[PDB]
Structure formats: C-alpha cells, structure tokens
Design an enzyme around this catalytic site. Structure first.
Site, mmCIF file in Angstrom:
data_model
loop_
_atom_site.group_PDB
_atom_site.id
_atom_site.type_symbol
_atom_site.label_atom_id
_atom_site.label_comp_id
_atom_site.label_asym_id
_atom_site.label_seq_id
_atom_site.Cartn_x
_atom_site.Cartn_y
_atom_site.Cartn_z
ATOM 1 N N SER A 171 0.846 -1.203 0.000
ATOM 2 C CA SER A 171 0.000 0.000 0.000
ATOM 3 C C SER A 171 0.879 1.251 0.000
ATOM 4 C CB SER A 171 -0.985 -0.163 1.162
ATOM 5 O OG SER A 171 -2.073 0.734 1.049
ATOM 6 N N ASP A 189 -9.606 -6.171 -3.448
ATOM 7 C CA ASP A 189 -8.738 -5.101 -2.962
ATOM 8 C C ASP A 189 -9.346 -3.714 -3.167
ATOM 9 O OD1 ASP A 189 -6.402 -3.761 -2.134
ATOM 10 O OD2 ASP A 189 -5.094 -5.006 -3.374
ATOM 11 N N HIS A 201 -7.091 -6.464 0.407
ATOM 12 C CA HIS A 201 -5.891 -5.639 0.498
ATOM 13 C C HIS A 201 -4.707 -6.375 1.128
ATOM 14 C CE1 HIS A 201 -4.126 -1.659 0.135
ATOM 15 N NE2 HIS A 201 -3.860 -1.586 1.426
#
Length: 303
Positions: free
Chosen positions: A111, A251, A278
């Site tokens: 991320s 995600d 995610h």
C-alpha cells in the site's frame, strides 16, 4: 537452515530518532535481503509480519517501523509539514546504510509502502535488485475515485453514515468509524475477526494516529491528508529493476488503481489473489509468500 531461523532486533539511529528494525533469517549468508515497507503512512510492521515466511527460502527479511509509530520514535507534536515523502525516503536510506545492505537489497512495499518503494526506485538506486508492489496506488485520485465506487456498493445506511460524518467533519465519531469497518471488512481485510497482528497495527494507529492523520486521513478511503494529490504515474518508467505487482480480487487497490504500475514499469509482471482483498499476505498467505519467494529467486541474488 538454522541460519534461516535467526531473529535479531535493534534500532537504527535516524537523526535524534530511532528506527526499530527486525531481521529474520540469514542476513549475510543468504541471498539478497528483502526489506518490508509497511503502509499507511503511519501503520506498523505488525500487519505485514507474515512476510517473515520468506526467510525460510534462504534470504533475510527485514521489517521496520517507519518513524512516527510502532516501536520507532513517536513525534506527536509534529504536523503535516514534518511528515513527508522525503522524510521517509531519508529514513529508508538511513536504515539501508546502517545495516550495510545498500549494495544489495530488494524492497516489498505494501500500500503506502509500495508508493514509498516506488519513490525510492524511480531514483534508480544502484543497490536495488528487485521491487514488489503489493496493493498500491500510483495516483491518489484514482485510489479515492475507486474507493468511492466501492462505497456506492455498501449498504445505503452505511454510506449515508459515512457521508454525514465526512460532511460535518466528525471523523472520530464511533458511528463513522464503525460504518468504515463495513468497507474494511470487504476491501481491506476479509478475515473476520482480524488476525491479531493486523489488529496490532490498527490499535497503534488508534493510540497515536499522528502520521496516518497528517498524511492520509481518518480512514483508508477518506484521503484528505497531504498525500491526497500524490502521483508517481509519469515517473514509473524510470524503475530499472524487475518488479512484481500483486493485488487481491476484492482489494480497495482495484485493478484500475494498480494498473499504472503494470503499464509503465519496463520490467514488470503481475499476480492476483482471488480470495483476497488488500492483505493477500494474510488472506492467502501460502500463495502470496510462494509467489514473492519465487520472484526473488528468479531476479535477485541467492545463497
């Protein structure tokens, strides 16, 4: 194999501050060591703990808490002006030189970690061998645009709750935060209840949200901090190492969110985890570690 089961912990001094790190596995006898860059900004290593699995493939795995949360120095008096990409790029360079791995290392960024890793890699550092971008945006407007699209699929009262508190600014209201968890349970982590190591990260944000609030916002999808206009899309073609892009079917980093990495990095391949959102590293841990390990064996140095 005993060398692969070693653990060491320490602090890398960074200015007046301390960068906590953990080394799992064979740092000097193994292959190219892998540095794990957690997300946020303002998260901790805890929810990406599972990448220590890669140590069993004969290279060390380095976790660390970025300045401002976790086991590293906390600085709650610092605001939006202190918490910058350049600060965390400097901290990363400091850690690499402190461990004396800056001649031969690989980065996995999750991320925000992938954003930070990409900022690092578009400078073409010579010791970088390989890049993994996991569940990352290349443009924060796309992140929010896709987040908004996913929010329109939430239950109507949940989206109404989120909008009401965002319009009023009551971003710490329990109704807003619990409405947020409906989104999280779909697109951030589908394991319910959360693995404790994921909970450890979110608990540390709650205890000191300084960095996450300054740079991101109150929630994953309401990005109003200083990263809200960030983009690396046009610079991605400068990355000159083999890159692996991974993402989850569910995600919040949707296919559109990650697409610029696939389209613009010259040496890139992509893998998708269909039961993940995610956090494939805990949602489909075995498959995720196997793909990353295989990628590093192919492109980095081994031992």
């Amino acid at each position: 194999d005993m060398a692969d089961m070693t653990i060491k912990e320490g602090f890398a001094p960074f200015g007046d501050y301390q960068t906590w790190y953990r080394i799992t596995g064979d740092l000097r006898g193994g292959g190219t060591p892998l540095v794990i860059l957690h997300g946020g900004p303002g998260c901790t290593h805890d929810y990406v703990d599972s990448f220590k699995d890669i140590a069993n493939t004969g290279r060390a795995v380095i976790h660390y808490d970025q300045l401002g949360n976790g086991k590293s120095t906390h600085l709650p008096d610092m605001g939006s002006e202190f918490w910058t990409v350049d600060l965390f790029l400097s901290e990363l360079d400091n850690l690499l030189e402190y461990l004396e791995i800056a001649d031969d290392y690989a980065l996995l960024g999750q991320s925000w970690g992938g954003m930070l890793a990409s900022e690092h890699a578009v400078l073409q550092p010579t010791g970088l061998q390989a890049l993994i971008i996991a569940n990352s945006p290349a443009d924060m407007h796309t992140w929010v645009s896709e987040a908004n699209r996913l929010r329109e699929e939430l239950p109507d009262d949940v989206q109404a709750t989120l909008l009401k508190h965002e319009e009023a600014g009551t971003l710490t209201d329990p109704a807003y935060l619990t409405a947020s968890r409906v989104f999280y349970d779909r697109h951030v982590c589908r394991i319910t209840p959360w693995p404790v190591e994921v909970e450890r990260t979110f608990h540390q944000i709650d205890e000191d949200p300084t960095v996450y609030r300054a740079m991101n916002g109150p929630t994953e999808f309401h990005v109003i901090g200083t990263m809200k206009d960030w983009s690396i899309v046009d610079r991605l073609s400068n990355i000159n190492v083999p890159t692996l892009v991974i993402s989850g079917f569910y995600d919040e980093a949707t296919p559109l969110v990650i697409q610029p990495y696939v389209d613009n990095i010259p040496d890139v391949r992509q893998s998708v985890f269909q039961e993940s959102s995610h956090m494939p590293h805990v949602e489909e841990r075995m498959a995720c570690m196997g793909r990353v390990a295989d990628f590093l064996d192919e492109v980095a140095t081994s031992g």
